[PDB]
Amino acid sequence: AFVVTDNCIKCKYTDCVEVCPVNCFYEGPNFLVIHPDECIDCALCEPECPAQAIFSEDEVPEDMQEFIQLNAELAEVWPNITEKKDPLPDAEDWDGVKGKLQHLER
Numbered sequence: 001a002f003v004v005t006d007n008c009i010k011c012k013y014t015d016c017v018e019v020c021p022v023n024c025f026y027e028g029p030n031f032l033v034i035h036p037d038e039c040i041d042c043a044l045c046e047p048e049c050p051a052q053a054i055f056s057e058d059e060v061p062e063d064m065q066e067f068i069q070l071n072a073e074l075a076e077v078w079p080n081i082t083e084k085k086d087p088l089p090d091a092e093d094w095d096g097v098k099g100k101l102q103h104l105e106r
């Protein structure tokens, strides 16, 4: 499974959903997650993220390990997203800010 980590929060570019063959991204107010059962690990999404927020599960930084289980739980509750949309309004002021997990919205 590929995992969306911290820098997606409040950026949510959605470029990643274009390339997903199996449409396993699920959508929150300010973040996207990958559903781990559905991802086939084709890795096509991770060059597409402008925030470079997607990682193969086995490559998630030590300080972002929380996101692996977060993606699994929120994918069970959030709606499927299959079409790119606009980036959040202020997405490039927040691109690159560390510590955005405290802004995540359910």
Ligand code: SF4
Pocket (backbone or CB within 6 Å): 001, 002, 019, 020, 021, 022, 023, 024, 025, 034, 038, 039, 040, 041, 042, 043, 044, 045, 046
């Ligand atoms: S690794 Fe492939 S299947 Fe998994 S989320 Fe990315 S594009 Fe979709």
Ligand code: F3S
Pocket (backbone or CB within 6 Å): 004, 007, 008, 009, 011, 012, 013, 014, 015, 016, 017, 031, 032, 048, 049, 050, 051, 052, 053, 054
């Ligand atoms: S910012 Fe998030 S919405 Fe996709 S393109 Fe990157 S994982």
